[PDB]
């Protein structure tokens, strides 16, 4: 009943969201930082390949590895495909205003085809056509 983070969660549970955003931000982020540091520390001491490990170590690693997974912004990370295939201050973009809002004038007058949320939409030879898992699963089987 004296740990800095063990009272933070309790006081958040009791008081609730009656305070401003920053206090809730810090109170939630403390435990996240602690968890990431612990998991990274355990992972460092390990080996890489799974053919050189015992049973208990393999189970521990496979259980605790998954907390580093990310799902939403993979494409932005991976776009850096351009090097494998070949061999911007918002204003130059079309369909986006300076305040990161949609520009209706161009999209309604000039008949803009698509909106370049990210780079690589200018010109483009990397394709990357959207798919559906179930169609592929039926196709294979």
């Amino acid at each position: 009943m004296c740990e800095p983070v063990s009272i933070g969660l309790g006081i958040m549970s009791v008081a609730g969201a009656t305070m401003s955003a920053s206090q809730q931000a810090k109170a939630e982020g403390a435990a996240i930082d602690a968890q990431n540091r612990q998991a990274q520390e355990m992972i460092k001491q390990m080996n890489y390949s799974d053919a050189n490990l015992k049973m208990q170590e393999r189970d521990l690693k496979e259980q605790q590895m998954a907390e580093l997974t990310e799902t939403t912004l993979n494409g932005i990370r991976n776009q850096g495909v351009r090097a494998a295939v070949a061999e911007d201050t918002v204003k130059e973009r079309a369909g986006i205003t300076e305040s990161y809002n949609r520009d209706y004038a161009a999209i309604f007058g000039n008949r803009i085809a698509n909106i370049e949320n990210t780079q690589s939409a200018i010109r483009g030879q990397g394709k990357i056509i959207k798919t559906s898992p179930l169609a592929h699963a039926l196709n294979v089987a």
């Binding site: 939403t72 912004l73 008949r111 803009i112 085809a113 698509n114 949320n117 990210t118 939409a121 990357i128």
Partner: peptide
Amino acid sequence: SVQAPEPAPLSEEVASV
């Protein structure tokens, strides 16, 4: 609720008149 998030798109297609 919130079954699964929606991945961010590279670029999006629209239409006009």
